[PDB]
């Protein structure tokens, strides 16, 4: 069954500019049960695929839609899949979101903290608010830039 | 279940009226198959069910459909064994249902009857 999924997913290629520059982007979907990512088929498709985009029922019920788990999702292609306009704001967004993920435990004691820490906390909890989206309303690249 | 479903199929198709199809535990419709499956010579699947669980469930669940000439609203009770929502028999029904209504034991243990789990029971409407 690993051979099953790998024979299929390895067909998604970016051709060699002498075969025609065309490509096929595979976006497979896999359902985990109780978040057991150590299950057999999820581990297979994770080992096979390039990156992963994890979703969370906790984030989903907590309001944030689409409930992307950014801290645990990976992309092995990386910034080479962005335009030059996106990288400049993406670096700062990634750093500030990482600082918010660090200081998330200090939110209940936001009152008794340094002003820089309160700034990082407020910037985090209003950067989380622009990552919310409604269903079937996809932003163009200029709007998200 | 197929008998009652056939009786509802007739009322939807030939009489063209809104049928209301109540089913008790469709976990038993899968459990009976898993009971006979070993004697049918089939090799066992995951945790103990028949290898044809998804197709056997899917045939019955796909015959239940509003067909643009009449509708069938079907309210189904799905016994979840050992309160394990990741069991294969409920897991293969979650794909066939529109509005799932998951009942919690932690609310029944307090008296929040109807113990409908608010954060687990979602709906597509």
């Amino acid at each position: 069954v690993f051979y099953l999924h790998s024979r299929l997913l390895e067909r998604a290629a970016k051709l060699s500019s002498l075969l025609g520059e065309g490509s096929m982007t595979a976006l497979p979907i896999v359902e985990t049960q109780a978040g057991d990512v150590s299950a057999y088929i999820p581990t297979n498709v994770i080992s096979i695929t390039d990156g992963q985009i994890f979703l969370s029922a906790d984030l989903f019920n907590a309001g944030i839609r689409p409930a992307i788990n950014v801290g645990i999702s990976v992309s092995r292609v990386g910034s080479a899949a962005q335009i030059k306009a996106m990288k400049k704001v993406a670096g700062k967004l990634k750093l500030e979101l990482a600082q918010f993920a660090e200081l998330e435990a200090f939110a209940q004691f936001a009152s008794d903290l340094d002003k820089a820490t309160q700034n990082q906390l407020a910037r985090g909890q209003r950067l989380r608010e622009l990552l919310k989206q409604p269903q079937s309303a996809p932003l163009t690249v200029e709007e998200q830039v | 279940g197929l008998t009652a479903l056939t009786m509802a199929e007739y009322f939807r198709d030939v009489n063209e009226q809104d049928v209301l199809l109540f089913i008790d535990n469709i976990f038993r419709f899968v459990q009976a198959g898993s009971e006979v499956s070993a004697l049918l010579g089939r090799m066992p699947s995951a945790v103990g069910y028949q290898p044809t669980l998804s197709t056997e469930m899917g045939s019955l669940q796909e015959r239940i459909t509003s067909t643009k000439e009449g509708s069938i609203t079907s309210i189904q009770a799905v016994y979840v064994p050992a309160d394990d929502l990741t069991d294969p028999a409920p897991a293969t029904t979650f794909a066939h249902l529109d509005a799932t209504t998951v009942l919690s034991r932690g609310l029944a243990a307090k008296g929040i009857y109807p113990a409908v789990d608010p954060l687990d029971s979602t709906s597509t409407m």
Binding site: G35 | D83, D84, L85, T86
Partner: peptide, 11 residues
């Protein structure tokens, strides 16, 4: 459903 119990306890 005991492994999800231990997973949530660890969490």
């Amino acid at each position: 459903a005991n492994l999800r119990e231990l997973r949530d306890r660890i969490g």
